[PDB]
Amino acid sequence: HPETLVKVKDAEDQLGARVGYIELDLNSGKILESFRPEERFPMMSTFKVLLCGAVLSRVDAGQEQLGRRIHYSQNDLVEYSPVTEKHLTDGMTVRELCSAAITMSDNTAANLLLTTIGGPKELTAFLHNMGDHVTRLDRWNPELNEAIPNDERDTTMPAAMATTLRKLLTGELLTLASRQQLIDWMEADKVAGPLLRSALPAGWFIADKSGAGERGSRGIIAALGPDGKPSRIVVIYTTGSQATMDERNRQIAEIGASLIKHW
Numbered sequence: 001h002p003e004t005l006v007k008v009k010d011a012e013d014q015l016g017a018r019v020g021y022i023e024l025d026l027n028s029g030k031i032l033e034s035f036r037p038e039e040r041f042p043m044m045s046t047f048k049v050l051l052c053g054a055v056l057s058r059v060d061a062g063q064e065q066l067g068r069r070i071h072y073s074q075n076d077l078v079e080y081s082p083v084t085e086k087h088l089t090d091g092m093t094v095r096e097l098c099s100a101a102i103t104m105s106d107n108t109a110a111n112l113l114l115t116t117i118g119g120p121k122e123l124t125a126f127l128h129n130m131g132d133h134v135t136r137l138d139r140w141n142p143e144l145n146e147a148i149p150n151d152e153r154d155t156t157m158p159a160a161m162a163t164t165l166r167k168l169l170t171g172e173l174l175t176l177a178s179r180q181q182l183i184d185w186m187e188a189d190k191v192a193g194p195l196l197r198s199a200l201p202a203g204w205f206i207a208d209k210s211g212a213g214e215r216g217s218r219g220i221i222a223a224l225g226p227d228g229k230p231s232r233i234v235v236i237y238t239t240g241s242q243a244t245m246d247e248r249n250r251q252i253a254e255i256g257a258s259l260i261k262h263w
């Protein structure tokens, strides 16, 4: 609905920055609405969903185990590791790391997992293999959040990310059990409150992943829908704003309000 695009443009005005947006039909893959669908934006923490998808693919293939324990030390800790920080002693399982990476956006968890699969080059290779020739991971946390203007590193495009998410959640890529696990992690996201969740009506379903980075970078990927089932994928990215975190959250939430209103 174009009324939503009105809000997206308004957000651009308010934030004084580019906003990338896409509304995708989960079932058919049809693009319902878009704004800057093919411009690059830093993925930030949204990459974690793809990372865990790759992990799950290995689990499916027998090359990885969810129960496998990973040990790390103070040395591996990076900024913002609320979960990993508390488990230095006993370590954490792959499953727990994906949970922390997705639900709490634990940066260290993500790094550990990245290493585990072979690094950014491998995640990228994984995406390429699934038909995503746009999305690329080049660095680890925290560098991947630099958001240097015009830098293609660690970026995606709203249309690419939407499409990839659709494949991950509904394609034959992962086994059903792994698909569900991924969705369950995204549904349990605990740090995305002020975003789309704030505009979500009761009884609706939401599986998401937020992210923030330098240079006013903020974004969210989500699968949502009424009556406890997802039916659309929404991707929203922004970068370049000088606005405060709260200002950025509000705009994203208002975008969500509009998309819900015009459902």
Ligand SMILES: *C(=O)[C@@H](NC(=O)Cc1ccccc1)[C@@H]1N[C@@H](C(=O)O)C(C)(C)S1
Pocket: 043, 044, 045, 046, 079, 080, 104, 105, 107, 142, 145, 191, 209, 210, 211, 212, 213, 214
């Ligand atoms: C992913 O996007 C992570 N972001 C940061 O570590 C980058 C950052 C944030 C603020 C200032 C400077 C750099 C984790 N993702 C977000 C998100 O999910 O909202 C957090 C803020 C939780 S950290």
